[PDB]
């Protein structure tokens, strides 16, 4: 269905599946984790500081993140 907040059971599931995706954007995390968009954008700010994802370009319409140090 839909979820506005985050659940502790699915909390750890995000740290192991989102950094593994090639395209990391709230439009993709929303479809795969049933996140209602707003929580998806704020979740990437938490992942950005922890070092799991890195920012390549940030815009008011669409933000893109990549896999952190995978080469």
């Amino acid at each position: 269905n839909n979820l506005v907040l985050f659940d502790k059971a699915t909390y750890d599931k995000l740290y192991k599946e989102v950094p593994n995706y090639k395209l990391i954007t709230p439009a993709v995390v929303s479809e795969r984790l049933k996140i209602r968009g707003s929580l998806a954008r704020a979740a990437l700010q938490e992942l950005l500081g922890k070092g799991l994802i890195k920012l390549v370009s940030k815009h008011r319409a669409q933000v893109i993140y990549t896999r952190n140090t995978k080469g």
């Binding site: 395209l23 439009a27 479809e31 968009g37 370009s57 319409a61 990549t66």
Partner: protein, 157 residues
Amino acid sequence: LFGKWSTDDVQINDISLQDYIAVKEPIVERVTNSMMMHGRNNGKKLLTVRIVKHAFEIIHLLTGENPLQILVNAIINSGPREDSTRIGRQAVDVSPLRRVNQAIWLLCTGAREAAFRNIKTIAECLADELINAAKGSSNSYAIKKKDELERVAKSNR
């Protein structure tokens, strides 16, 4: 001496589809103009550029190649090769240019209807249409329309 990318030794395999050379050694202009359509997006070129600029990012990060080499590969493999007219039905070859015109029209329309009834960003669906149209992934919209127009052309001839 370099444009938005390096594009070292751009390869155009087919000789017939060798018309868009304005950015090679402009297709980037025509792809931005063909996206602003369907009424409520007319007269917004800068809006489509941000969609294309974000599309090149998704293409460059998903494939280890130049972003332009996926755009040309999409229109060169999704371009039609036979149409059916009203002869009063023969498989008519289109053009070296009509293949470029109709393929881009199918790419913009593909990400349009697939993102209207779904919650997806246009900048993502455009990049998704290019990777699906290349090599004929059998799941895109341009390939599904190309194979359909070629199947009906062979039947009524």
